[PDB]
Paper text:
Here, we show that [name], which has 79% sequence identity with MABP-1, is responsible for macrolide antibiotic resistance in [name]. Similar to MABP-1, [name]-form 1 and [name]-form 2 are both composed of two domains, the kinase-like domain with a phosphate-binding loop (P-loop), and the N terminal accessory domain that consists of six α-helices: α1–α4 helices (residues 1–114) and α6–α7 helices (residues 158–199). As demonstrated in MABP-1, [name] also has ATPase activity with a kcat of 0.00864 s–1 and Km of 0.231 mM, values that are comparable to that for MABP-1 (kcat = 0.0137 s–1, Km = 0.285 mM). The structural studies verified that [name] can assume two different conformations, the closed state ([name]-form 1) and the open state ([name]_form 2 and [name]-ADP).
No electron density for the N-terminal 97 residues (α1-α3 helices) in [name]-form 2 was detected. The SDS-PAGE results of form 2 crystals showed four bands, suggesting that the missing N-terminal 97 residues in [name]-form 2 were probably degraded during crystallization. However, the N terminal accessory domain in [name]-form 1 and [name]-form 2 have different conformations. In contrast, the remaining α6 and α7 helices of the N terminal accessory domain in [name]-form 2 are positioned far away from the kinase-like domain, in a way similar to MABP-1, which leave the substrate binding pocket open. Structural superimposition shows that the [name]-form 2 and [name]-ADP complex have similar conformation to that observed for MABP-1 and MABP-1-erythromicin complex structure. For [name]-form 2, the degradation of N terminal 97 residues may decrease the steric hindrance, which release the compact arrangement of N terminal accessory domain. It is likely to represent a transitional state between [name]-form 1 and [name]-ADP complex structure.
Residue numbers in the entry: 98 to 181, 185 to 375, 393 to 437
């Protein structure tokens, strides 16, 4: 059965937070608001009156999944033999092992919470208590990004896209991290106009922030300055030296990043959307997160001033 019994919930809270956990609450609702992913979320009222979310993991989930990962690795071994993409295996081992210890995502969320405290554009729920199998955070509600994808005014969609773009370009500058690969479930629209970010399970660390070579590359690509574009690309890791590349192939490569900054306000959309081999990680991560944000923006059909935000936040993009 999907919902875990109250006794087991109390057992988890006892094992993780102690037998006196109830003293930290003004109230605690023993029936789960959500209950799917090897565990469930409860709503409660903390001692100071703040509404709180309490994520609690199923007791047997840990070892079960730990065995299952080894299992899937082999089975695909057999598959590798049978028909020569296992990156999927790496990828979901990586995403799954995050859930074995909530403290990881909790720490990422802490980082973003301090970095974006009292920010006029972003809202991050504060981590109140953290344990391997239990994590308590501030309850935060607003219009989910999925809802805004399906319905809602163009103004709202443009706002969400703008917020996500600002998050993508601005995160590595504020703290040496990126929010990572996201889906619209991670975001919501608060009444005051801020974007709420409530999932940090795929946060990517990025020491030093964006390499200036990115902004340089996109800028020079827009300016058609090939003679200075190519060396900056070879320096960025975009290209290898001694590589026969056609100029189109370059354009083909960079249009995904250059087209939105050709104009003052670019209209992200699905239709436009339709159209790493020894890379350095400090280049590979930005491209992937940016791709994520672009996909979401196209889902939002958002009109985003990417040129201004880049110019302000992306190193090396501003005119020299």
């Amino acid at each position: 059965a999907p919902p875990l019994p109250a006794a087991k919930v109390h057992r988890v809270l006892d094992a993780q937070l102690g037998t006196k956990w109830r003293d930290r609450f003004s109230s605690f609702d023993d029936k789960p608001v959500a209950s799917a992913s090897i565990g469930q979320v409860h709503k409660g009222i903390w001692s100071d009156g703040r509404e709180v979310a309490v994520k609690i993991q199923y007791p047997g989930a840990d070892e079960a999944l730990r065995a299952d990962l080894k299992t899937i690795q082999r089975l695909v071994g057999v598959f590798k033999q049978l028909a020569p993409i296992q990156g999927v295996v790496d990828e979901l081992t990586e995403r799954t092992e995050m859930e074995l210890d909530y403290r990881l995502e909790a720490d990422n969320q802490r980082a973003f919470a301090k970095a974006y405290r009292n920010d006029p554009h972003f809202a991050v729920p504060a981590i109140i208590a953290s344990a391997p199998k239990v994590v308590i955070s501030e309850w935060m509600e607003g219009i989910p990004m999925s809802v805004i994808i399906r319905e809602g005014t163009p103004e709202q969609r443009d706002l969400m896209g703008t917020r996500l773009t600002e998050l993508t370009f601005g995160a590595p500058a504020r703290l040496e991290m990126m929010h990572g690969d996201a889906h619209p479930g991670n975001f919501m629209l608060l009444p005051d106009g801020r974007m709420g970010v409530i999932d940090f399970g795929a946060v990517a660390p990025l020491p030093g922030g964006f390499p200036t070579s990115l902004g340089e590359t996109i800028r020079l690509a827009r300016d058609k300055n090939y003679d200075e574009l190519l060396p900056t690309m070879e320096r960025a890791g975009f290209l290898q030296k001694g590589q026969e590349v056609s100029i189109e192939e370059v354009e083909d490569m960079l249009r995904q990043y250059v087209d939105p900054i050709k104009v003052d306000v670019f209209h992200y959309n699905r239709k436009w959307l339709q159209k790493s081999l020894d890379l350095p990680a400090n280049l590979a991560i930005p491209l992937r997160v940016i791709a994520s944000t672009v996909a979401i923006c196209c889902q939002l059909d958002a009109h985003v001033p990417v040129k201004v935000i880049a110019t302000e936040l992306v190193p090396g993009f501003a005119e020299e």
